[PDB]
Amino acid sequence: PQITLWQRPLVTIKIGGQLKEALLDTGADNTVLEEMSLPGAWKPKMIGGIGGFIKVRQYDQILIEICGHKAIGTVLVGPTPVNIIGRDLLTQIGCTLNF
Amino acid sequence: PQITLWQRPLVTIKIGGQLKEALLDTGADNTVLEEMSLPGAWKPKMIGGIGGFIKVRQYDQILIEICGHKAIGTVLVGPTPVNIIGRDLLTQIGCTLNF
Numbered sequence A, B: 001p002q003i004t005l006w007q008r009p010l011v012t013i014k015i016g017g018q019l020k021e022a023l024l025d026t027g028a029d030n031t032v033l034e035e036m037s038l039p040g041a042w043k044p045k046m047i048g049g050i051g052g053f054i055k056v057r058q059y060d061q062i063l064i065e066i067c068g069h070k071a072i073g074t075v076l077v078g079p080t081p082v083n084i085i086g087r088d089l090l091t092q093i094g095c096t097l098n099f
């Protein structure tokens, strides 16, 4: 699967039994999801982007299906306006930039 | 040129006669550079990411060299902590996500 970038690279993901749309984001170090509940313990965390910072809950060893590829990683949950798939998970699905 | 994502995808750019490092960012709609001066008119603009918004100056029809590929696009200039190459320019150099 090749994905061109003329439109936002939004893919379907499955996480915590739920189906969501998320943006494949090579500029994000971490994967950040809009508010939802997940299993295990979590830790308070802060992540900065353009403009400022948000408070997030960090969950470890979470199973995620990304465009029908399975990966297990750390997911952050918090007041992001878009679900973000960052490099931590992009590497796990063998995602590369090519030109 | 393929670029894997184990590290931040930082490339060399040349813009306004200057050499800079920038992040190939499929999660950004627009290209945003740290403070610098550029030719022609500019228009005030506000852009949001995670955490909040920043005020930027928008410059049109700017020549940029990205990984040694020439592109002419709109460049935003403002208080970003990282130079960001967004989809507007990524499409111009024929950049795709592959897995």
Ligand SMILES: Cc1c(O)cccc1C(=O)N[C@@H](CSc1ccccc1)[C@H](O)CN1C[C@H]2CCCC[C@H]2C[C@H]1C(=O)NC(C)(C)C
Pocket: A023, A025, A026, A027, A028, A029, A030, A031, A032, A047, A048, A049, A050, A081, A082, A084, A086, B025, B026, B027, B028, B029, B030, B031, B032, B047, B048, B049, B050, B080, B081, B082, B084, B086
């Ligand atoms: C630069 C830009 C535009 O021109 C237009 C729309 C969005 C953005 C934008 O900032 N996008 C971001 C995703 S967060 C996001 C928010 C809203 C919509 C889509 C993505 C970047 O791809 C990632 N972005 C790149 C970079 C931006 C400058 C600050 C340091 C990083 C922070 C990082 C980021 O925010 N990462 C999180 C882990 C906090 C998610």
